[PDB]
Design a binder for this molecule. Structure first.
Ligand code: SRK
Ligand code: NAG
Length: 346
């Protein structure tokens, strides 16, 4: 039970219900690598659906029932057997308790039943970790899965800007976005663009500055879609995305003998996803029907073109020291149907 809970000392930075947000930390003395992982878990965007989430998903809205420890798994494991990539790093798990895809900057108040403080939670965790050893870091990898993967895209450059202004320009900030690269595509039957548009207003959601300047007022929802926000980012970002992501299929109103219309729909989804990753140099996109990878204990098992994700991430680290012999970083399946890759999760 190796990561220990710390509630934020700034208790004005809160989960949805006003309880303090926080982070779980396992230090690694002598490592200058820091991994900050953003949990996922959908979102809510109005009073009624946030109230329902509060009834049955309360740990995603409140710290009141959080345990004092959590076990690090996958990329958060400290065992090299489970985590070939960063087993010796300082590990931080940031629970998702803001329901805002890590974008919010609004407090609970006279006018607001809930606080949506995801963007401020990340900033406050960073600021409090600086006094716990992060000041000595050489690399800060902001990672996340699901809504936390989108949260990486939305926040990695702000973490970089925050550290620059605080006087730490030597800390290299990088992003690892897992299962947070979604398409605003046609549904199979006739959605996130509208839910996100409403959420931004309900949350006081913030997006990266260059993306905001491109899309402008009322169109900031566009910045929640990876293929649109990614080209605006300055920090190096590695993108992990199943080609047939289960959350993508859910928001597309697909639920799984497949007939021609659905076959063509699924094949087109994989082709569109692949297309959006063509110019993403650090990416890992297997042709599987699944969701999330990096904190799963068996995350080492899947391979694209014979290369596992821990290996690809290691090659990315080397690339950030011309391509490297036998150590690739751009790994996107080309086969067109779920589980055409034999290494897909069972
Ligand atoms: O992965 C998760 O936690 C669940 C799904 C999720 O979060 N989705 C799906 C659609 C979308 C568009 C923009 C931002 C986020 C999301
Ligand atoms: C606490 O967090 C709030 C919201 O981000 C910020 O405005 C304020 O400066 C912080 N206060 C302290 C003492 O860190």
């Amino acid at each position: 039970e190796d990561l220990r809970l710390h509630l934020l000392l700034n208790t004005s930075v809160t989960c949805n219900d006003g309880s303090p947000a926080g982070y779980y930390l396992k230090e690694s003395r002598g490592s200058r690598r820091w991994l900050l992982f953003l949990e996922g878990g959908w979102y809510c965007f109005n009073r009624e659906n946030c109230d329902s989430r509060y009834d049955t998903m309360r740990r995603l809205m409140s710290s009141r029932d959080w345990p004092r420890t959590r076990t690090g798994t996958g990329i958060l494991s400290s065992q090299p057997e489970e985590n070939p990539y960063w087993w010796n790093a300082n590990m931080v798990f940031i629970p998702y308790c803001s329901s805002d895809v890590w974008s919010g900057a609004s407090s609970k108040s006279e006018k607001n039943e809930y606080a949506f403080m995801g963007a401020l939670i990340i900033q406050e965790v960073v600021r409090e970790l600086l006094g716990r050893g992060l000041s000595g870091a050489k690399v800060l990898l902001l990672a996340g899965s699901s809504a936390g993967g989108t949260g990486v895209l939305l926040n990695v450059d702000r973490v970089a800007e925050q550290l620059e202004k605080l006087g730490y320009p030597a800390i290299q900030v990088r992003g690892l976005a897992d299962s947070g690269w979604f398409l605003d595509n046609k549904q199979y039957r006739h959605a996130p663009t509208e839910a996100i548009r409403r959420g931004i207003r309900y949350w006081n959601g913030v997006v990266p500055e260059r993306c905001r300047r491109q899309f402008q007022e009322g169109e900031e929802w566009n910045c929640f879609f990876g293929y649109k926000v990614y080209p605006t980012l300055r920090s190096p970002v590695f993108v992990v995305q199943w080609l047939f992501d289960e959350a993508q299929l859910t928001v597309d109103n697909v639920h799984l003998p497949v007939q021609e219309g659905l076959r063509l729909y699924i094949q087109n989804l994989g082709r569109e996803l692949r297309h959006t990753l063509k110019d993403v140099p650090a990416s890992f996109a297997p042709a599987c029907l699944s969701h999330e990878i990096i904190i799963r204990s068996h995350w080492t098992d899947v391979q694209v073109k014979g290369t596992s994700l821990p290996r690809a991430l290691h090659c990315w680290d080397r690339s950030l020291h011309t391509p490297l012999k036998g150590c690739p970083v751009h790994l996107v399946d080309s086969c067109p149907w779920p589980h055409c890759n034999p290494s897909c999760p069972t």
